[PDB]
Design a protein around this ligand. Structure first.
Ligand SMILES: COc1ccc(Cl)cc1C[C@@H]1CN/C(=N\N(C)C)CN(CC(=O)Nc2cccc(C(=O)O)c2)C1=O
Ligand SMILES: [Cl-]
Length: 224
């Protein structure tokens, strides 16, 4: 997260990180006691999942292994269309004050909407700086018509764009797969943008979650 600030404590209880060892690989969100949603480009053979603390490495955090994960079948490695994946926890998260399910959307929030994206990703770019503390930053949804001016053929109608005009405020390496939430609901998963991070007027791009709820529900149901 570039040009952001520490998340207020205990207010991102649905945020997780996917770790490789004790090293951050991706962000993600808790859908339920069994499942984490995150980006497809985070796929690994095995994951260690951190839940229930704004601070990485916290004594109080839960660490659960996840040995199985399920990418959206329409995911493209070449173009990153359909960049989402469900991650099955090897055991059920203990829900608590610091561990809640995210509110999945029932609606696509429109352009102009104010959102918060959260993550333990680099706070600088290209020179990297990693925070223990979960960082948050507010951006507005940006219309396909506006975002296509910048990115053209790269965009799908299931990708959602967000930023602030003339603003470095954005996500970055480590934030991948993590929550963009707007008006209480999960509206995006951090997918891609430009390098280095935080170039003014290059919006961050997100998997638009409101277009994949059927898949998310069917897949959890199918893999009960
Ligand atoms: C330049 O990066 C941007 C730009 C805009 C957004 Cl919204 C988000 C990012 C973060 C990227 C997103 N996408 C990426 N690949 N795409 C093309 C599928 C790369 N990525 C994964 C990544 O770099 N993870 C990572 C994890 C841990 C350590 C490091 C490291 O560089 O040290 C990197 C993103 O997170
Ligand atoms: Cl898969």
């Amino acid at each position: 997260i570039i040009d952001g600030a520490p998340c207020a404590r205990g207010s991102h209880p649905w945020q997780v990180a996917l770790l490789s060892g004790n090293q951050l690989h991706c962000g993600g969100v808790l859908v339920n006691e069994r499942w984490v949603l995150t980006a497809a480009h985070c796929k690994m053979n095995e994951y260690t999942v951190h839940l229930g603390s704004d601070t990485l490495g916290d004594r109080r955090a839960q660490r659960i292994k996840a040995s199985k994960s399920f990418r959206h079948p329409g995911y493209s490695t070449q173009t990153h269309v359909n960049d989402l994946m469900l991650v099955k926890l090897n055991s059920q998260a203990r829900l608590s004050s610091m561990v809640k399910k995210v509110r999945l959307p029932s609606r696509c929030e429109p352009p102009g909407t104010t959102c918060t994206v959260s993550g333990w990703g680099t706070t600088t770019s290209p020179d990297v700086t990693f925070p223990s503390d979960l960082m948050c930053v507010d951006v507005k949804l940006i219309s396909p018509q506006d975002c296509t001016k910048v990115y053209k053929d790269l965009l799908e109608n299931s990708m959602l764009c967000a930023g602030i005009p003339d603003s470095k405020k954005n996500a970055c390496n480590g934030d991948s797969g993590g929550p963009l939430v707007c008006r209480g609901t999960l509206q995006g998963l951090v997918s891609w943008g430009t390098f280095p991070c935080g170039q003014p007027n290059d919006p961050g791009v997100y998997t638009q979650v409101c277009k994949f709820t059927k898949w998310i529900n069917d897949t959890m149901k199918k893999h009960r």
